[PDB]
Amino acid sequence: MDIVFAADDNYAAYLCVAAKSVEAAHPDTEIRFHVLDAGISEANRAAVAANLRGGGGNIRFIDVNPEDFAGFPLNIRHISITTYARLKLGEYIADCDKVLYLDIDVLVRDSLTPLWDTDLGDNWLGACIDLFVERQEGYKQKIGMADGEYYFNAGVLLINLKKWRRHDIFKMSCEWVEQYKDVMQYQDEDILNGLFKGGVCYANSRFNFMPTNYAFMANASRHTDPLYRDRTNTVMPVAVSHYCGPAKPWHRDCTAWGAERFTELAGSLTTVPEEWRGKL
Numbered sequence: 001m002d003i004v005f006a007a008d009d010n011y012a013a014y015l016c017v018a019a020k021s022v023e024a025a026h027p028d029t030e031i032r033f034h035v036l037d038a039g040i041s042e043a044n045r046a047a048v049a050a051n052l053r054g055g056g057g058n059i060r061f062i063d064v065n066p067e068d069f070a071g072f073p074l075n076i077r078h079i080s081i082t083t084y085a086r087l088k089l090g091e092y093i094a095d096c097d098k099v100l101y102l103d104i105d106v107l108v109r110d111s112l113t114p115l116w117d118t119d120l121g122d123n124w125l126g127a128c129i130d131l132f133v134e135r136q137e138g139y140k141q142k143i144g145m146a147d148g149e150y151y152f153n154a155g156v157l158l159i160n161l162k163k164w165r166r167h168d169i170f171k172m173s174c175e176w177v178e179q180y181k182d183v184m185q186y187q188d189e190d191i192l193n194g195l196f197k198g199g200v201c202y203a204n205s206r207f208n209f210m211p212t213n214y215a216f217m218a219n220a221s222r223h224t225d226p227l228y229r230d231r232t233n234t235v236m237p238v239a240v241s242h243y244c245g246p247a248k249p250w251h252r253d254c255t256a257w258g259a260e261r262f263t264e265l266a267g268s269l270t271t272v273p274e275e276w277r278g279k280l
């Protein structure tokens with residue numbers, strides 16, 4: 001499968017860890033990494049590729065310009081401008097009709113092929129519902145969504161590239177961001193939801209297990225709709241842990257579930273540059 005990650009120099013070492021976890025979950029699957037590079041040094045991309053299979057044979061860094069999104073709101077502190085690069089997927093990747101976008105702060109624990117094998121038909125993408133946002137009575141509607149349309153998290157995405165390449169997603173994002181600039185609160189996550197509402201395929205929450213999903217394991221469903229309940233019901237085992245929010249598995253005092261696998265994988269790296277010692 002073709003996996004897509006987006007990062008800048010600051011997250012280079014983390015990109016490496018998330019990347020390796022994907023490989024560990026797919027021992028016999030050919031993982032092709034496409035990285036949206038917003039300023040990763042040559043030393044940093046060299047160390048990354050060095051820690052993966054084939055001495056970094058299945059990874060290509062695609063240069064992107066962070067200044068491109070300079071006008072987009074950046075209210076959430078722990079997130080950098082690089083978060084909006086995914087909006088130009090259709091422009092940065094040609095050799096794929098389908099890719100699976102992953103946030104750097106994810107930890108892939110199980111095969112992703114069941115999610116990958118999803119047939120998105122003519123929809124824009126496949127994604128997991130976001131409970132934290134979905135249960136914030138009245139928000140989803142500020143961006144034009146209906147109670148029946150479900151707000152998804154942009155940390156894990158099966159994108160129908162061929163369809164994306166047909167449209168000018170960056171211009172529609174600009175247009176939308178001008179329409180809902182004084183209300184959106186989740187940035188690129190808002191853009192994607194507004195733009196593709198009503199045309200999204202939903203996947204079980206096992207492919208995007210977040211803190212809110214976890215907390216719910218200790219159950220009360222924002223809806224009665226059988227589809228929603230079916231989707232927001234994680235079918236064990238968790239395939240993707242998404243450390244959504246300010247607390248990351250690489251931080252100090254991380255209490256988030258399964259956060260140990262980060263270290264387990266960090267301590268298994270082939271090459272660790274002196275400058276990475278800290279971060280890990």
Ligand SMILES: O=c1ccn([C@@H]2O[C@H](COP(=O)(O)OP(=O)(O)O[C@H]3O[C@H](CO)[C@H](O)[C@H](O)[C@H]3F)[C@@H](O)[C@H]2O)c(=O)[nH]1
Pocket residue numbers: 005006007008010011076078079080082083102103104105153154155156186187188189243244245246
């Ligand atoms: O120093 C940084 C900070 C952010 N990033 C990029 O930004 C993504 C964005 O942020 P987090 O993973 O840190 O975001 P977070 O998951 O905490 O929060 C929520 O809001 C985000 C947007 O503001 C996304 O929609 C995200 O999927 C959603 F869960 C990272 O994966 C990465 O691609 C970097 O490369 N370096």
Ligand SMILES: [Mn+2]
Pocket residue numbers: 103104105106155242243244245
């Ligand atoms: Mn994230």
